Design a protein around this nucleic acid. Structure first.
Lengths: 200, 25, 102, 125, 91, 229, 101, 150
RNA sequence: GGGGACGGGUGAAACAGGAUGAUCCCGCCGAGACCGCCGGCCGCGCAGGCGCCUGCCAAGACCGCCUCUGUCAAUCAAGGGCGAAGGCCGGGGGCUAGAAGGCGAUCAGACACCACCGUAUUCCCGGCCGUAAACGGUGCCGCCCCGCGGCCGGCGCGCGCGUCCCGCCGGCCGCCCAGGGAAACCGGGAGGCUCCGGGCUCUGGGGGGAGUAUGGCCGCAAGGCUGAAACUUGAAGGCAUU
């Protein structure tokens, strides 16, 4: 209900008992009902398989990556979000990965990840279009819509508050050490405004 | 390039003339 | 490479024109079991349970089984039919199939 | 006592610097610009002549009896001709008594280069 | 025929409301979601979108993960090829 | 070598000079002296000079044969500081810039191939080679240009000579093969059957990857003079 | 009228050609129009070459000679006298003046 | 010159002035016709069977020996191809160009070639229909072209 | 890591960079463009255009041919596709260069050229645009066409024999005899044409007004395509000579 990404019920054998365990996995694009998936140090290299990040070759797109080994899923678990394997330090057993923000983190090669890019990709591309398709969207998630702008609220409800004209009246940028009730504007803003060429 | 600069002035006048036409449409 | 690909295309066309051929799995298994089959051509798209079952009956009747590129539609286009054709059996061939074991 | 002197010639200023064979540690450095007050005179060989004379005293104090010569222009997308002070740089060292070892071009020439300043019409001076 | 002359073909429902830019983007996104993509296994163009991220062949009955408004997204298709070329290289 | 013995400038008021020695295959092993700041808090001088890269000419490395291969240079990187003397391993080779320029001419076709070779040891190296065409003796026309069939055949040929020459040999064998110019020679004989060719020389060979701690490889490279083989 | 039948460009069967740059102007000129000279000259000044060679500790080390190609635009070349405005009859000659150095 | 190309090349076979069985000929007209049928059973396109007779055997021109052209001989035995071979070869070329284009929508040059080959198919087809070699019903369908090959 | 006062820039300068150690040297990494020298009277392509490596995929002209077909052809309103750059609209990415924008010199002014910084853009992907001095300022198919040279491909003849000699065909070119033109010049045509007729499409009819007005269509726009008149005027133009 909450996720815009499909989840897949994959049934593995139970090594401890006689049962077949059912595990809910993020479904990478192309996973098909009936697909056989292999998990482990000796796992193969097909979209779907879960194998230690070190084992996966550099350049592969991988999803549901583990920040630290045996965390059972941590990074790249949203729609169309993938993590790229940048490099493998053999001496430090540390593997660099580009998270879907661009930022690079070093992860123990022992950590696990799933080969593939998560499904439901290109979802943001569709305009929501109506307020109603937004209401139906956040019903599944928390009560965080509709949003009232703070400059519409009276002085007592929001720090932006209300005067004879709707204005913030003070710099939106607020200090990092602002107390709980004070942090309402843009926080720790290194820069503000639409400039361009921001790749520098 | 006087011919080029002349067609830029014609294009400017044609933009202003069409915009003024629209105000009174 | 494509010199051979043309030969496979010309054998299929000439079998369709002259010779007896069966389109589909139910017809294929019935013929393979009775040994009517001379060659079996299977599309890559054929289901992976069907592929392993035909392969065994073909081993039992000692009848060669080959994979035709991929997609039943592609086999279908080569047999000249719009409907998909997973398994084509060559019972008899108007153009000798030297590519029986291509 | 072999060492290598990399001589930037280029234009605008002349850099005469003697270093270890690795290039990691600089035995000595001097610039044509330091010697001349006027900015235009900085690439000129007279400024450079006074300049490598000063460097010779510092380098010969630190051994460096023999040097190898690597000379480079602006290179990259600019000039590719050594320019002014480069000819003086070997000559002044020869006056000093430093012994030449091998001479080479260190121009940073570009395979498939990036665009250079000026525009299609060029510097319309 | 030609009931609607312009790209208002699937956007006739939205009416005058929503603006041309929105509708223009929807005309491409909704045309693809409604369309029947080919089944990788069925080999029939009967795959249809059951839900965002879920596309089901109406012949095989197989359900396959895919993009929200298209069975195969271009980034996934590139990765599918990259993974195949990297596996065959590691073999 | 001046500061350790006596007075030199403020930086070199506390500095040392360490002898640098090249591999066994070369006639004059000593390369030169390295300036290095004396031992400090974490900056142990020997650790500081562990990975310095020297550029030696083959004429300097193997003197008395300067006229041949005066252009060819070898980049060598220290791997060990034993005996107060830096011991270096081969990390790169390139022909000089003055020669690279003299290699190209109008009315000639240039073939450059890059082929990364996994050696019989740990090192992985890319061999960059160059070849040019030359006028046949009769030459009614003035241009040494060849049809595509010669171009493809010749480039296929170059890869093959490296395949059966530098493809499966260890780094000490490679150093002897690039120094005596043996592998460069092999491409020419193969090319000579294929066409009229000039300048068929391996221009550059770079260390793409180094097996960690090639100390054992530096024993064979430096002190296996007895195993010259 | 047509001052030059080659139209100022050695462009035949081409339609479009690659682009190059005036060394000093940094102008953009089509490759066909560019003057294009190849100059091979000593790395050191020829006047100082003999002394440098004698000082060169290396036995039989030839002085390295720089090999470079200089390309200028028509405007750039006329000012730098790389090529000279010539009479209508003299334009038709295509042979280098006073006989590449 | 070529209809869709600006080339003016002239590589043309020139048939012999004297239309006669070769002096070294040792075969009857019926013998050649019986041989032709065997190659027709093999499915070899009519141009190829003429090349085979000229190179594998030594009949330079079929009209010179048999007294009829190869396609006329095929028609007599009803071993003629349903589509005249010339149209079939362009239709097959169009099918391959379409297949390559289906993988690549960015090959703008390939689309250009497809328009010309398809235009040639349409132009030739109209002539065959007027001649009555092919049915008035014939129409070129890109969708059915691959099936038409069979 | 090094070593120690400037560095950039220029026509001279000045601004921004330097003891928070710059410039400079050496290794190392990241990022994106871009295919250097070979590279052209080289070539390919329908033009626009096209140059790293290894593949992969369909092509294309040309030549060779005693292969097949038997007028299936030519040129083309409408109609369809393609179309440098800049621009646009959704997505990326972002080094460099860089319209705008900011600065620093100059000058009477400079707000322009030259320097410095820098956004859109350049690059990619899906669309749109539909224009260039898009030129070779020369439509296309057809024939005849005077010799002399080069170059590219295919083929043939001959001999010492070599990427030789001589052709042929298709191109890419230079010089020209005739001829032509108002000439400049074309001469593989701009020749064979006042002794004017091979075929077929497009456009032009003194200079402005004016590619404007208005109407239509097309475009998200920018604009494109079509397109006047009233009126004014005795010149406008080409190529050569001094």
């Amino acid at each position: 209900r909450g996720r815009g990404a499909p989840l897949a019920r994959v049934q593995f054998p139970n090594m401890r008992g006689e049962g077949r365990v059912n595990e809910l996995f993020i479904a990478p694009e192309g996973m098909y009902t009936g697909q056989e998936v292999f998990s482990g140090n000796k796992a193969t290299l097909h979209i779907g398989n879960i194998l230690p990040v070190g084992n996966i070759p550099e350049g592969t797109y991988v999803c549901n990556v583990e920040e630290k080994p045996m965390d059972r899923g941590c990074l790249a678990r949203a729609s169309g979000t993938y993590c790229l394997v940048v490099a493998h330090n053999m001496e430090t057993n540390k593997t660099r990965i580009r998270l879907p923000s661009g930022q690079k983190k070093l992860i123990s090669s022992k950590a696990r990840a799933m080969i593939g890019l998560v499904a439901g990709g290109g979802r943001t591309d569709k305009p929501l279009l109506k307020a109603g398709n937004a209401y139906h969207k956040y019903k599944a998630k928390r009560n965080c819509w509709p949003v009232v702008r703070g400059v519409a609220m009276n002085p007592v409800d929001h720090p932006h508050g209300g005067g004879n004209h709707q204005h913030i009246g003070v710099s939106s940028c607020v200090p990092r050490n602002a107390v709980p009730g004070q942090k309402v504007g843009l926080i720790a803003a290194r820069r503000t405004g639409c400039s361009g060429g921001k790749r520098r | 390039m006087r011919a080029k600069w002349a067609k830029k002035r014609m294009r400017k006048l044609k933009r202003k003339r069409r915009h003024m036409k629209a105000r009174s449409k | 490479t494509k010199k051979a690909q043309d030969s496979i295309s010309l054998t299929l066309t000439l079998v369709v024109k002259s010779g007896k051929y069966t389109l589909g799995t139910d017809q294929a298994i019935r013929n393979i079991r009775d040994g009517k089959a001379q060659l079996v051509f299977m599309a890559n798209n054929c289901p992976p349970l069907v592929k392993s079952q035909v392969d065994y009956l073909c081993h039992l009747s000692k009848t060669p089984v080959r994979v035709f590129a991929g997609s039943s539609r592609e086999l279908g286009i080569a047999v000249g039919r719009q409907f998909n054709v997973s398994i084509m059996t060559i019972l008899e061939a108007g153009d000798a199939d030297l590519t029986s074991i291509l | 006592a072999f060492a290598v002197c990399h001589i930037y010639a280029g234009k605008n200023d002349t850099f005469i610097h003697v270093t270890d064979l690795s290039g990691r540690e600089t035995i000595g450095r001097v610039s044509g610009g330091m010697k001349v007050k006027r900015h235009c005179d900085e690439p000129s060989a007279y400024a450079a002549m006074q300049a490598t004379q000063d460097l010779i005293e510092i380098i010969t104090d630190r051994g460096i009896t023999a040097v190898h010569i690597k000379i480079r222009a602006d290179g990259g997308t600019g000039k590719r001709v050594y320019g002014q002070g480069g000819s003086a740089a070997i000559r002044a060292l020869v006056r000093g008594g430093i012994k030449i070892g091998r001479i080479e071009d260190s121009t940073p020439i570009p395979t498939d280069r990036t665009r250079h300043k000026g525009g299609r019409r060029g510097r319309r001076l | 025929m030609a009931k609607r002359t312009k790209k208002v073909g699937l956007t006739g429902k939205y009416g005058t409301r929503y603006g041309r830019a929105a509708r223009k983007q929807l005309l491409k996104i909704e045309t693809s979601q409604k369309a029947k993509y080919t089944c990788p296994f069925c080999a029939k163009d009967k795959v249809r979108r059951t839900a965002c991220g879920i596309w089901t062949c109406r012949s095989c009955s197989k359900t396959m993960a895919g993009g929200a408004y298209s069975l195969h997204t271009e980034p996934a298709n590139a990765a599918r090829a990259t993974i195949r070329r990297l596996r065959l290289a590691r073999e | 070598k001046k500061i350790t013995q006596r007075k030199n400038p403020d930086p070199y008021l506390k500095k040392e000079w360490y002898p640098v020695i090249a591999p066994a295959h070369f006639k004059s092993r000593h390369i030169g002296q390295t300036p290095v700041t004396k031992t400090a808090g974490l900056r142990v001088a020997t650790d500081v000079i562990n990975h310095r890269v020297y550029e030696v000419n083959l004429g300097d490395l193997n003197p008395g044969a300067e006229d041949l291969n005066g252009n060819t240079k070898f980049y060598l990187q220290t791997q060990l500081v034993s005996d107060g003397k830096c011991l270096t391993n081969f990390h790169g080779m390139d022909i000089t810039r003055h020669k690279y320029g003299s290699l190209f001419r109008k009315g000639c076709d240039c073939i450059d191939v890059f082929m990364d070779i996994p050696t019989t040891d740990g090192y992985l190296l890319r061999v960059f080679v160059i070849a040019f065409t030359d006028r046949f003796r009769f030459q009614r026309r003035k241009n040494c240009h060849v049809k595509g069939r010669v171009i493809r055949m010749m480039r296929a040929g170059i890869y093959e000579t490296l395949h059966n020459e530098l493809g499966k040999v260890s780094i000490p064998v490679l150093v002897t093969k690039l120094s005596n110019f043996e592998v460069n020679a092999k491409l020419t004989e193969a090319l000579q059957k294929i066409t009229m060719c000039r300048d068929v020389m391996i221009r550059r060979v770079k260390v793409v990857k180094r097996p960690r701690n090639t100390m054992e490889l530096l024993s064979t490279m430096h002190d296996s003079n007895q195993v010259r083989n | 009228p047509v001052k030059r039948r080659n139209n100022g460009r050695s462009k035949y069967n081409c339609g479009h050609t690659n682009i190059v740059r005036c060394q000093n102007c940094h102008r953009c000129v089509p490759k066909d129009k560019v003057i294009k000279r190849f100059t091979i000259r000593n790395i050191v000044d020829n006047t100082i070459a003999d002394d440098v060679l004698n000082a060169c500790v290396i036995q039989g080390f030839a002085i390295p000679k720089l090999y470079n190609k200089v390309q200028y635009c028509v405007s750039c070349s006329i000012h730098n006298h790389i090529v000279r405005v010539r009479s209508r009859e003299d334009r038709k000659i295509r042979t280098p003046p006073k006989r590449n150095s | 010159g070529r209809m869709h190309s600006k080339g003016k090349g002239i590589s043309r076979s020139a048939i012999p002035y004297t239309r006669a069985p070769a002096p070294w000929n040792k075969y009857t007209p019926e013998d050649v016709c019986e041989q032709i049928c065997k190659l027709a059973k093999k499915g070899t396109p009519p141009s190829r069977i003429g090349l085979i007779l000229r190179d594998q055997f030594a009949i330079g021109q079929v009209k010179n020996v048999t007294g009829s052209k190869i396609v006329r001989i095929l028609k007599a035995k009803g071993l003629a191809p349903e589509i005249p071979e010339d149209l079939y070869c362009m239709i097959k070329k169009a099918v391959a160009i379409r297949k390559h284009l289906e993988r690549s929508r960015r090959d703008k040059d390939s689309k250009f070639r497809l328009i010309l080959v398809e235009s040639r198919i349409h132009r030739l087809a109209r002539y065959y229909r007027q001649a009555r070699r092919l049915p008035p019903t014939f129409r070129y369908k890109s969708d059915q072209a691959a099936a038409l090959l069979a």
